[PDB]
């Protein structure tokens, strides 16, 4: 049980940018021995691994409220070949940050004629 993430997708057709809102997560796995996590989300639009953004870290919670929005410049015609990755991590002070899980959204599975808001279960990295 890794939890789930609520996100929004909004394609701004005038600017040619995909707006990705990271709203909140719920029921996240605890990646600290004390039974909690310090969650943040790294967001990137595959296959571009260079343009990556990270939310603020939230302290000791498995139900973080993020309220972040990032965007990626991508022509609408190319969008179906992109895969959005929202990778949820647990920030640590004394060791590497820990993967909690990720949500992968093949953009071909979304219709962005109008904006969408959805929940998806976190999965282990492939
Ligand atoms: Ca940890
Ligand atoms: Ca931690
Ligand atoms: Ca760690």
Curated annotation (Swiss-Prot):
The name under which this protein is listed is Synaptotagmin-5
Q: Which of this chain's residues are annotated to bind Ca(2+) 3?
A: 92, 95, 98
Q: Which GO terms describe its cellular component?
A: axon; dense core granule; exocytic vesicle; neuronal cell body; neuronal dense core vesicle membrane; perinuclear region of cytoplasm; plasma membrane; proximal neuron projection
Give the record's family classification: Belongs to the synaptotagmin family.
- Report domain C2 positions: 1-120
Q: Which residues bind Ca(2+) 2?
A: 31-32, 90, 92, 98
Provide the residue positions that the database annotates as binding Ca(2+) 1.
32, 38, 90-92
Which keywords, in A-to-Z order, does the entry hold? Calcium, Cytoplasmic vesicle, Endosome, Membrane, Metal-binding, Repeat, Synapse, Transmembrane, Transmembrane helix
Q: What does this protein do?
A: May be involved in Ca(2+)-dependent exocytosis of secretory vesicles through Ca(2+) and phospholipid binding to the C2 domain or may serve as Ca(2+) sensors in the process of vesicular trafficking and exocytosis. Regulates the Ca(2+)-dependent secretion of norepinephrine in PC12 cells. Required for export from the endocytic recycling compartment to the cell surface.
Extract the GO molecular function terms from the UniProt entry: calcium ion binding; calcium ion sensor activity; calcium-dependent phospholipid binding; clathrin binding; phosphatidylinositol-4,5-bisphosphate binding; phosphatidylserine binding; protein heterodimerization activity; SNARE binding
Would the keyword Hydrolase turn up in this protein's UniProt record?
Answer: no
Protein source organism: Homo sapiens (Human)
GO-annotated biological processes: calcium-dependent activation of synaptic vesicle fusion; chemical synaptic transmission; regulation of calcium ion-dependent exocytosis; regulation of synaptic vesicle exocytosis; vesicle-mediated transport
Keyword Transcription regulation set for record? no
In terms of the parent sequence, the fragment covers: 108 to 233 of 386
Relate the assembly described in the record: Homodimer. Interacts with both alpha- and beta-tubulin.
Q: Can you say where in the cell this protein is located?
A: Cytoplasmic vesicle, Secretory vesicle, Synaptic vesicle membrane; Recycling endosome membrane
